[PDB]
Amino acid sequence: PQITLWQRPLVTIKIGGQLKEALLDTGADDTVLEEMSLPGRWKPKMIGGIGGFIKVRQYDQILIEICGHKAIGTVLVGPTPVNIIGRNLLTQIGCTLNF
Amino acid sequence: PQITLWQRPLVTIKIGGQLKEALLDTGADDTVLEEMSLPGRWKPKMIGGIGGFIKVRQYDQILIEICGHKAIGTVLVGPTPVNIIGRNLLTQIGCTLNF
Numbered sequence A, B: 001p002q003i004t005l006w007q008r009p010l011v012t013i014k015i016g017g018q019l020k021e022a023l024l025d026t027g028a029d030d031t032v033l034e035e036m037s038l039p040g041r042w043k044p045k046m047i048g049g050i051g052g053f054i055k056v057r058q059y060d061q062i063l064i065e066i067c068g069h070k071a072i073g074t075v076l077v078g079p080t081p082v083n084i085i086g087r088n089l090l091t092q093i094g095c096t097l098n099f
Ligand SMILES: O=C(N[C@H]1c2ccccc2C[C@H]1O)[C@H](OCc1cc(F)ccc1F)[C@H](O)[C@@H](O)[C@@H](OCc1cc(F)ccc1F)C(=O)N[C@H]1c2ccccc2C[C@H]1O
Pocket: A008, A023, A025, A026, A027, A028, A029, A030, A031, A032, A047, A048, A049, A050, A081, A082, A084, A086, B008, B023, B025, B026, B027, B028, B029, B030, B031, B032, B047, B048, B049, B050, B051, B081, B082, B084, B086
């Protein structure tokens, strides 16, 4: 589809068998979701944005469905104020910026 | 133009007769640039990101050229890690997300 930017570009995603709301964020290098339980081992990481850095748990090889599209990639979990779908997964669904 | 997201969506902008690099960020509600001098009076604003909040200066009716497209709107100035072009200006240039 084609998404306008008059409002925040929020979409529904399916992960770990759960439906959540997330933001399509071209300014985010990676994908970060609010605290939740995911399978497998994880690695600690620090990510920075406006305001500073936060510590997150890094999980690799996670399957996510974005608007009916299946994508696989690294997913970070931590105290983010909103669920963020970053570039690492946006590329997999063939998302582009156009004007 | 059509921009893929395999790399950061950086473009050249022109403001105050100077060329700068900025990120096209659909996840940012507003446009914020690194410390610089702009004309007129400013008002205070607080913006929150992934790591907390930062105080910025708000300037209105500022001319800014993005990838050749002229836009006139609100620009925030403050301790941002990178120059960010937010939805307020992305909509002025007709930018949309597609997949
Ligand atoms: O921190 C960032 N990337 C980092 C990131 C994020 C997730 C995972 C990894 C990485 C690392 C880095 O890319 C991005 O900023 C630029 C940025 C880019 C970069 F390239 C390096 C450092 C940077 F600061 C960030 O994802 C923004 O896309 C956006 O974050 C999601 C979000 C959306 C909301 F609607 C509300 C709250 C919220 F938090 C955000 O902070 N929006 C707020 C904002 C911004 C400017 C003006 C006003 C307002 C109010 C909000 O909209």
